[PDB]
Each structure stands twice: as structure tokens, then as C-alpha cells.
Design a protein around this ligand. Structure first.
Ligand SMILES: CCCCCCCCCCCCCCCC(=O)O
Length: 207
């Protein structure tokens, strides 16, 4: 159809989308959910959809004909996706309210271990990134867009509902851009389902 459904949360993701600051429409490559245990039982925090400009597919021809499992366990393939000279974006849709401390804790846990010694440029990028979320309630239904323009530039947008239409911030930092990608597609993805979904789709596409 025109929309895909994320199994666990039932959140719908349009298969082809036009995103803020992106010239060409992007195609949905995978979906998944992120769950976390704050107390006793794990709960679903958000649904996520990863999009890519179809132009990056040609750049992954070295992996043609590989299985989903081979693709999933190949770090070089995901690094190649990150390095591709095209636009990619992650659409996060909150399925529960997220308060300030919860948000900062998660951001710190994701960034800090990956950037032990931030450069002045990284600090500036992170400050700009955080400013967008400061004094901003992240209630259920909120949509966050993390768009990769290149290996060092990202466009970030947030809405309280519906796909953002504006670019809230543009940041420059290879370390921050790389760190955020690793959060979702590295060895310990926060959303194993999202990574597996992307791997499966790539296996079908790189045939
Ligand atoms: C566990 C609650 C976290 C709330 C997630 C809100 C989405 C913010 C997107 C910015 C990326 C920050 C990386 C951390 C991702 C994560 O821990 O789920």
C-alpha cells in the first residue's frame, strides 16, 4: 500500500515521504520499536521508521545477493549506508509521554559512551540539538526527525503530532552524526527490531 505498519505499536509509516530539507522523496527501508524497562516491566516508548534516498542502493552493490542474516551481522554494510552520499532519515513516533529527565538520561546514555572527549564542534552541535528539546513537552504522538545529509551534517525537527514540515536545527559534527547512527544500527541497537527490519528489506532489494 502507501503505508507500512509497525507490528508492535501499529504505528503507520508512509512508504514514500518528502522530508524537511531533503530534495528527493525518501523510501521506507524498515520499521521497529524501542522498549525500555523503567521500573518492573519493559514498555514500548516509540515506533521508528528508517528512510533512504533510493540512490544509495547502487552504492551497496557489493552486498548483492546476500541473506537478511548475513546483512544484519555485517557492520561494513551499515557503515556503508551511513557513508552513502545521499539523504537518510529516522522518523521516531512516541507512543507514550516522555518527561525531561527521561529524555536527557537517554540522550546522555546514547551520546556520552560514544563521544568520550567531545571536540568544541561536537559541544556546539549537541547544545544546538538539545536546545530544540528544552522546555518542550514530549507527549505521546510527538514525531522526531533525525535526518542525515552527509557524514557530518544533520537536520533535526520535532512536532507534537504529524510529520514535521520545518527544519528546527541544522548541526555540523561528524562525531555526533556518527554516534546517532550507531545508536540505531551499531552492535547494540536500541531497537533490534528496526535493524532487523532494515536488514530484511535490504536482502529483498539487493537481489
Ligand atoms: C527511553 C526514552 C527515550 C526517549 C526517546 C525520544 C527520541 C529522541 C531521539 C534522539 C536520539 C537519542 C538517542 C537515544 C535513543 C533511545 O535511547 O531510545
Amino acid at each position: 500500500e502507501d503505508y507500512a505498519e509497525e507490528t508492535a505499536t501499529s504505528v503507520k509509516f508512509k512508504r514514500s515521504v518528502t522530508l524537511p530539507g531533503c530534495s528527493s522523496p525518501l523510501s521506507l527501508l524498515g520499521t521497529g520499536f524501542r522498549e525500555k524497562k523503567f521500573a518492573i516491566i519493559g514498555v514500548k516508548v516509540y515506533a521508528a521508521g528508517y528512510y533512504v534516498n533510493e540512490s544509495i542502493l547502487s552504492g551497496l552493490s557489493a552486498w548483492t545477493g546476500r541473506s537478511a542474516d548475513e546483512i544484519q551481522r555485517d557492520s561494513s554494510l551499515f557503515v556503508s549506508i551511513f557513508q552513502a552520499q545521499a539523504e537518510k532519515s529516522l522518523q521516531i513516533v512516541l507512543v507514550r509521554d516522555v518527561d525531561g529527565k527521561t529524555f536527557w538520561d537517554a540522550l546522555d546514555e546514547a551520546i556520552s559512551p560514544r563521544i568520550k572527549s567531545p571536540s568544541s564542534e561536537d559541544t556546539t552541535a549537541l547544545s544546538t540539538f538539545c536546545c530544540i528539546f528544552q522546555n518542550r513537552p514530549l507527549n505521546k504522538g510527538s514525531v522526531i526527525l533525525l535526518t542525515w545529509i552527509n557524514t557530518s551534517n544533520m537536520l533535526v525537527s520535532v512536532s507534537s503530532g504529524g510529520l514535521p514540515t520545518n527544519v528546527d536545527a541544522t548541526i555540523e559534527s561528524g562525531n555526533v552524526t556518527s554516534a546517532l547512527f550507531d545508536v540505531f544500527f551499531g552492535d547494540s541497537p536500541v531497537s533490534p527490531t528496526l535493524k532487523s527490519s532494515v536488514a530484511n528489506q535490504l536482502a529483498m532489494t539487493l537481489v
